Amino acid sequence: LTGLCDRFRGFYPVVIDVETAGFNAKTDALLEIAAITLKMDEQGWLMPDTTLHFHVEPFVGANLQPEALAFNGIDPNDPDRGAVSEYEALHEIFKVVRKGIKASGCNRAIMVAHNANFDHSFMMAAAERASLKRNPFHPFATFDTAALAGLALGQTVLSKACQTAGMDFDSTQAHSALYDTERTAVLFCEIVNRWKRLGGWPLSAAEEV
């Protein structure tokens, strides 16, 4: 009942955010990525588990839109950014994720993200460029927190959804993949946990007052 593997039909939810050099996942550089796995305690409450974060070197041949760099404030040419390759970052994320899937008894990872298709498309595109094998993420399914917040909170904008959920949100950190990932993780957890607390889950709960 209270196992993570039982909650989402065997899907292992992993929160992801990316910063990029444009809107096109095929052609534009991936610049930052963070990942936060989740776990469930003995009573079935969801919380963050492992957190990873990387500055990513633009792939060879990548386009970099000036408007994108102006938006997120990232300078990919700054040698002090401590960047790593797409391979290094994703290989590390996938290793932690496979470990969590195994240890929890899940069978596949699913990406949790805000307007998820965007992050999913960039992560998948980078995975293919790096030639990583046995990608543990579902190839098309996601848990979009904008839609989820729409239901739970009546809000679709990340900052606003967080504020409505009673969370802090610091706009000076809003262009950091890591920061956005942590806020998104806490938001997703607040949504799932309040669903449970109000007797929405497990399905049996409503008849046991």
Binding region for its own copies (CB under 8 A): 6-9, 11, 115-118, 140-144, 146-148, 150-157, 160, 164, 191-192, 194-195, 198-203, 206
Tokens at 43, concatenated: 């009573």
Active site residue 53: no
Quick one: what does residue 39 bind among Mg ion, Co ion, its own copies, none, with the CB cut-off 5 to 8 Å set by partner type? none
Least distance from C-beta 179 to Mg ion, angstroms? 10
Stretch of 77-85, 113-121, 125-133, 157-165 lying at the interface with Co ion (CB under 5 A): 77-85
Regarding 91 and contact with Co ion (CB under 5 A), the answer is no
Tell me whether residue 26 or residue 95 sits nearer to its own copies (CB atom).
26
Quick one: what does residue 81 bind among Mg ion, its own copies, Co ion, none, with the CB cut-off 5 to 8 Å set by partner type? Co ion
SS3 content of the chain, % helix, strand, coil (to 5): 45, 25, 35
Segment 46-53 long-range contacts (CB within 8 Å, at least 24 positions apart): 46/4, 46/7, 46/188, 46/189, 46/192, 46/193, 47/189, 48/15, 48/182, 48/185, 48/186, 48/189, 49/100, 50/96, 50/100, 51/178, 51/181, 51/182, 52/92, 52/93, 52/96, 53/177, 53/178, 53/181
Regarding 81 and contact with Co ion (CB under 5 A), the answer is yes
Least distance from C-beta 82 to its own copies, angstroms? 31
174: left (phi over 0), alpha (psi -120 to 50) or beta: alpha
Annotated binding site: 17, 19, 175, 180
Count of CB atoms situated within 10 Å of the CB of 184: 26
Least distance from C-beta 83 to Co ion, angstroms? 8
Tell me whether residue 58 or residue 136 sits nearer to its own copies (CB atom).
136
Least distance from C-beta 92 to its own copies, angstroms? 26
Quick one: what does residue 47 bind among Co ion, Mg ion, its own copies, none, with the CB cut-off 5 to 8 Å set by partner type? none
Q: Nearest to residue 97, comparing CAs of 178, 19, 35?
A: 35
Annotated binding site for Mg(2+): 17, 19, 175, 180
Q: Which of 55, 91, 120, 175 is catalytic?
A: 175
Distances in Å between the alpha carbon of 200 and those of 161, 162, 194, 196?
A: 20, 21, 9, 5
Q: Which residues bind Co ion (CB under 5 A)?
A: 81
Catalytic machinery residues? 175
